[PDB]
Design a protein around this ligand. Structure first.
Ligand code: CA
Ligand code: MG
Lengths: 84, 77
């Protein structure tokens, strides 16, 4: 991708519990089945395809972007407000 | 506050975006990742950082022997 506009964002560990992230972002509508315990797990589901850096999921008010993968998981992601 | 940038971003582009008018160069094409590796001297590891002008440049990821992602923030020293 080209250099991104600097807007408010958070850098988050892919292993952060899903519920913890939803709570902190004030998301009240999300999967409650617990099949994907972590934020990166849920992102991988939503992507369907094999994850790679720069891939992103639009969910609620937000864009969740993979910063890096390691050990076949989303290691770090960035969250910002979505712009669509 | 803090800005996430790709290590492969041309050096001159990042410098100008940050309003840094005085910066190190040689005769080779340079990237922000490249400049940081020059300033670090040591082999790059996540969390390693470079202080230059008003800013801290922190390694967020290394991938393929280069600094892949970095975070820019204001320095505090
Ligand atoms: Ca969080
Ligand atoms: Mg890496």
């Amino acid at each position: 991708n080209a250099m991104r506009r600097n807007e408010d964002s958070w850098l988050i560990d892919g292993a952060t519990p899903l519920e913890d992230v939803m709570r902190a972002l004030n998301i009240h509508t999300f999967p409650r089945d617990e099949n994907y315990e972590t934020i990166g797990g849920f992102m991988m589901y939503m992507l369907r395809k094999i994850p790679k850096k720069t891939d992103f999921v639009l969910y609620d008010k937000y864009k969740f972007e993979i910063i890096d993968t390691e050990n076949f998981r989303i290691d770090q992601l960035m969250v910002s407000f979505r712009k669509d």
